[PDB]
Design a protein around this ligand. Structure first.
Ligand code: HEM
Length: 185
C-alpha cells in the first residue's frame, strides 16, 4: 500500500483510539511512532494488517469494526486531496465514477492492482456496486460508502447481496437505494 494513505489510516487510528494505543502498535512492528512516511514510499499490505491487529488487541475492538470506522472517516481526507471529485456532484454520480477514479489514479504505477468498484443502475432509485480485490477489505469498502453518504448529506440504504472469494479475488456486491429517484430521464 502507498505511504501517506496508510499514514492517513494511522492518523485516523490516533483520533479514534489515542496516541498511546497507536505508538505501541507501531512499536510492536518495529516502527518508530515518529517515523516519517515520505511522500513517495510504499508500505507493505501485511505490515498494515499487523498494525491493525495490534490496535484491535489493545482496544478490544474487532478489527472489522475498526476498518469500517477508518473507511467512514477517510472520505473527508480524500476531499482535502481531491476536491474536484466532490465539487458540483451528487452522491450517485460520485459513486458511479469510483471505478474509473481508482483506475486513473493508479495507471502510472508499475504492477498496480486497484480495487474494482463497478456500479450500475438496477432500479430507478438504486445501484448495485461490486467490490472486487485480492485485498479483502470488505469493511473498509462498506465504511467508505457510509462516509460518502454522510459527506454529501444524502441518505441511503445499503443491502449486502453477495460476499465471497472467487478466482483468487474477494468480492462484495451491495445494493444502494437513494431516497428520491436518480435514473429517470
Ligand atoms: C475521492 C475519493 C477516493 C479516492 C481519490 C480514492 C482513491 C483510492 C486509491 C488511489 C486507492 C489505492 C489503490 C491501490 O493502491 O491499489 C484506494 C484504495 C481503496 N479504495 Fe478508494 N478512493 C476514493 C473513494 C473510495 C470509495 C467511495 C470507495 C468505495 C465505494 C473506495 C474503495 C476503496 C477500497 C476498498 C480500497 C482498498 C484497496 C483494496 O481494497 O484493494 N474508495 N482508493
Amino acid at each position: 500500500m502507498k505511504g501517506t494513505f496508510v499514514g492517513t489510516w494511522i492518523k485516523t487510528l490516533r483520533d479514534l483510539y489515542g496516541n498511546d494505543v497507536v505508538d505501541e502498535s507501531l512499536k510492536s512492528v518495529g516502527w518508530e511512532p515518529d517515523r516519517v512516511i515520505t511522500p513517495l514510499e510504499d508500505i507493505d499490505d501485511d505490515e498494515v494488517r499487523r498494525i491493525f491487529a495490534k490496535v484491535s488487541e489493545k482496544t478490544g475492538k474487532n478489527v472489522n469494526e475498526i476498518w469500517r470506522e477508518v473507511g467512514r472517516q477517510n472520505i473527508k481526507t480524500f476531499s482535502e486531496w481531491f476536491p474536484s471529485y466532490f465539487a458540483g456532484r451528487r452522491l450517485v454520480n460520485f459513486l458511479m465514477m469510483m471505478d474509473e477514479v481508482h483506475l486513473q489514479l493508479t495507471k502510472m504505477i508499475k504492477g498496480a492492482t486497484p480495487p474494482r468498484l463497478i456500479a450500475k443502475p438496477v432500479a430507478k432509485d438504486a445501484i448495485e456496486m461490486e467490490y472486487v480485490s485480492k485485498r479483502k477489505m470488505y469493511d473498509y469498502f462498506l465504511g467508505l460508502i457510509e462516509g460518502s453518504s454522510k459527506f454529501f448529506k444524502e441518505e441511503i440504504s445499503v443491502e449486502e447481496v453477495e460476499r465471497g472469494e472467487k478466482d483468487g479475488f474477494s468480492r462484495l456486491k451491495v445494493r444502494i437505494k437513494f431516497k428520491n429517484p436518480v435514473f429517470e430521464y
